[PDB]
Design a protein around this ligand. Structure first.
Ligand SMILES: CC(=O)SCCNC(=O)CCNC(=O)[C@H](O)C(C)(C)COP(=O)(O)OP(=O)(O)OC[C@H]1O[C@@H](n2cnc3c(N)ncnc32)[C@H](O)[C@@H]1OP(=O)(O)O
Ligand SMILES: CC(=O)SCCNC(=O)CCNC(=O)[C@H](O)C(C)(C)COP(=O)(O)OP(=O)(O)OC[C@H]1O[C@@H](n2cnc3c(N)ncnc32)[C@H](O)[C@@H]1OP(=O)(O)O
Ligand SMILES: [Zn+2]
Ligand SMILES: [Zn+2]
Lengths: 311, 311
């Protein structure tokens, strides 16, 4: 009853020193969709470069072969026709539009009016639909936007509700929210728009992302974003492995993820990305199942074979 | 207004492949108390072995030299006179007694009665006081105990309240609590015993320890336990660096920790302990301040120089 969007290949790629080859991205994409069973994957950003375009084409060639094309998503921008054209040629059929979720960002980067910007947005969604694509919209910096420019944010959502988009994404872009705050901002929107599919997208700057994610689930979110090993730009995104385990054991909601493929997904991403995880990394670290001082008295609901390890 | 107990040298030492030399423990102890300014440090477990006894003696020799002896604490057990004798010779003046916080543990390990066990407990506290020591009591497995054997737990606390101990520790020994749960169990006790100093001690098995810790602060806790780099047996203890930053920015409570010594405390522990931290480790990872894709628009309250880095 909860969709899971993995942004490991995109948001996770932005990380310093990390860059996946076409072979690695295809390998990871196949695993997450077929083995780990994550609902969808965000494999790239449009207009990044050629090669990245080729990469998306191969994955779409494959994804088509497997009736999964609708499960791949591309991060795009409000640039008129450039993003949609790029995604059009890539082979991908889904665009996750990046819009300004804070009045502060809109003015300091674009220097536009909520009216002007909404027109630019409507064009892109308009042109995207016209081009056979589906659209999800990111309210970038929403975490700061609903706390400082709550009006701009309400009109932006008000505008997107009159548009034909699949989902609206509420990201803690700078990862500055506490769980109480995440609940407020999300509850605020879900209660005004009970018919829109919202998904929370947290970042782990204060090591609160999965806790925040839980509160978002309380507020009424229908999906969550996460990356393997919490790969991402700063402290990374919400760590997929701990989020799912936490959703399964500490919430009445469910997920379609196969807990058993969790250890391999991690090893895969760790090797290919080249970013080592600590031995104590929750659920997925090397020594996380080892209790040397504990002298089934100290049995934890977190067992090695539950995640495809030690058996 | 919130005490911080660092268990990096003890609970953190239990970790697989980790063992600090007398020189390293002294170095870390001095830094945490003098530089990082953590209220107290738990440097060892009594009766572990000789050498560890020597180590505590040197630190006490030093701590005395600096009028800090009352800030060092030793993990002890309910063994009659053995623990108190050991701590007596060590030089340490504070004992953190390990008691059974769950009826399940008491019976499956000791096979004793709440009455019998309380008598053994009262002896140790009795004999400890008689020996010039101060006492804090750990309700081991409390996280499972207040959810399954809430009665045993209420009498245990009821008994400890009639004793002359400094504080009572509420540990999520197996790290299985959600923030909502942590609030319930802690609020439950604080409301029955408004005059006792309770401290939460979380573990990061679900990557919820600092979120749990925040709720404990809500419930009315007066202190928190944590380890540098979240060092600890399984997923480790609550990560000190993220806890403090989170307490400072996301709660109305305060701490006496010097945020500036945070990066060095981490490097110190990482090297000496030999457990590498990931580059994305919140607040304290190598690339945690780097945003390569972010194109002061993306200014986070988490700056490098705030923690003694990049300047
Ligand atoms: C949640 C918790 O922290 S559970 C804590 C359990 N144990 C500890 O904290 C002690 C940690 N031990 C050490 O650091 C040891 O020096 C090591 C591990 C480095 C090397 O020796 P080990 O034998 O591996 O240590 P071990 O794992 O046995 O430590 C457990 C200690 O708990 C002691 N213990 C636990 N309950 C009792 C009790 N009721 N009465 C007496 N001793 C007890 C055990 O006796 C042992 O100490 P001792 O056998 O030397 O007297
Ligand atoms: C919260 C966020 O995720 S902010 C996202 C910002 N940027 C991205 O997501 C794109 C990531 N870029 C890449 O992966 C690149 O291929 C790299 C970094 C690997 C190598 O090239 P770089 O130049 O370093 O990428 P860069 O950091 O510039 O990426 C930013 C992109 O946002 C694009 N962009 C942002 N806003 C707009 C806009 N309003 N109109 C057009 N393009 C925009 C920039 O143009 C750039 O893409 P482009 O210059 O190729 O058209
Ligand atoms: Zn993001
Ligand atoms: Zn512990």
């Amino acid at each position: 009853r909860l969709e899971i969007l993995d942004v490991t290949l995109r948001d996770g790629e932005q990380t310093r020193g990390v860059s996946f080859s076409t072979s690695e991205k295809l390998n990871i994409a196949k695993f997450l969709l077929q083995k780990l069973n994550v609902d969808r994957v965000e494999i790239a950003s449009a207009r990044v470069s050629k090669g990245e375009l080729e990469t998306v084409q191969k994955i779409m060639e494959w994804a088509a072969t497997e009736q999964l094309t609708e499960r791949i998503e591309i991060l795009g921008f409000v640039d008129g026709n450039k993003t949609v054209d790029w995604i059009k040629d890539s082979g991908a059929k889904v665009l996750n539009l990046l819009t300004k979720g804070s009045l502060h960002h809109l003015e300091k980067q674009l220097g536009k009016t909520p009216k002007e910007f909404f027109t630019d947005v409507s064009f892109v969604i308009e042109y995207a639909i016209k081009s056979g694509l589906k659209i999800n919209v990111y309210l970038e910096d929403w975490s700061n936007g609903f706390r400082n420019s709550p009006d701009y944010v309400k009109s932006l959502v008000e505008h997107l509700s009159k548009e034909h988009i699949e989902r609206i994404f509420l990201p803690d872009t700078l990862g500055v929210l506490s769980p109480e705050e995440t609940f407020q901002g999300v509850d605020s929107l879900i209660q005004k728009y009970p018919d829109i599919h919202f998904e929370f997208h947290g970042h782990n700057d204060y090591d609160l992302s999965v806790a925040n994610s839980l509160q978002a689930i309380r507020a009424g979110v229908k999906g969550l974003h996460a990356s393997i090993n919490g790969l991402g730009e700063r402290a990374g995104n919400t760590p997929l492995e701990a989020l799912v385990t936490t959703i399964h054991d500490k919430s009445n909601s469910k997920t379609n993820i196969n807990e058993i493929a969790i250890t391999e997904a991690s090893r895969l991403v760790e090797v290919f990305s080249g970013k080592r995880i600590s031995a104590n990394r929750p659920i997925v670290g090397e020594d996380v199942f080892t209790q040397t001082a504990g002298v089934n008295l100290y049995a934890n609901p977190i067992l090695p074979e539950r995640f495809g390890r030690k058996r």
